[PDB]
From a paper:
The SWEETs mediate the facilitative diffusion of sugars, by allowing solute permeation across biological membranes down a concentration gradient. SWEETs possess seven transmembrane (TM) helices, consisting of a pair of 3TM repeats and an additional helix that spans the membrane to connect these two repeats, resulting in the ‘3+1+3’ arrangement of TM helices. Their bacterial homologues, the SemiSWEETs, have only three TM helices. Previous studies have shown that the SemiSWEETs assemble into dimers to function as sugar transporters, and thus they are considered to be an ancestral form of the SWEETs.
We also obtained a crystal belonging to the different space group C2 (Crystal-II), and the structure was determined at 3.0 Å resolution by molecular replacement, using a protomer in Crystal-I as the search model. The asymmetric unit contains four EcSemiSWEET molecules organized into two separate dimers. Whereas the conformation of one dimer is almost identical to that of the inward-open state in Crystal-I, the other dimer adopts a markedly different conformation. In this alternative conformation, the extracellular halves of the protomers are separated from each other, while the intracellular halves approach the central axis. Consequently, the central cavity formed by the dimer is open towards the extracellular side. Hence, we designated this structure as the outward-open state. In the outward-open conformation, Phe19, Met39, Tyr40 and Phe43 of the two protomers form a cluster of aromatic and hydrophobic residues through van der Waals interactions. These interactions seal off the substrate-binding pocket from the intracellular environment. The temperature factors for the two conformations in Crystal-II implied that the outward-open conformation is inherently less stable than the inward-open conformation, suggesting that EcSemiSWEET probably prefers the inward-open conformation in the lipid environment. As the inward-open and outward-open conformations were simultaneously captured in Crystal-II in the absence of any sugars, the transition between these two conformations could spontaneously occur even without any substrates.
Residue numbers in the entry:
A (entry chain B): 2 to 93
B (entry chain A): 2 to 92
The structure:
Amino acid sequence: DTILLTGLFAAFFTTFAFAPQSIKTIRTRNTEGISVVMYIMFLTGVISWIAYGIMRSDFAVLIANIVTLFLAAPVLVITLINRRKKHVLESS
Amino acid sequence: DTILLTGLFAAFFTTFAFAPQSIKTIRTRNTEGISVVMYIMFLTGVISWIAYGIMRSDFAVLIANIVTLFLAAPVLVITLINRRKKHVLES
């Protein structure tokens, strides 16, 4: 109870601290400085964390990175789309 | 062993994906567009995670948040100095 309470408090603060910038970026679609490669690595760690949570039976590390997956994944997808739009625009 | 192997792989990628940007910002001291508050929140969870790693004997989540603390703490310390320096200069 004490351990899980502490972890959920740790969870909440880590994933939701900089979440407004992810949400803002998704809405605004301003991916001008975003690194595609740096997000790929980040997401690789995230999916792995989910797997690590399943193995160790840890709710906190599971729920945290599952949410952090869903906040970062669209940012990566949108960033890739914007670059693709740049490729076609430059090609024209 | 195989489980701890998975955690370290997860740890390495998450804490070192965006580490270059923090190291960059530390040296350049360009703390413009950096939230004091959002970093306050961040580091609070980090230390809480450190406490969680101790509590559940999870080596992987502990060292992950240990290192991540040394990437973030200088950024907040430096951005406080910058905002301070801007304030007295403006005054």
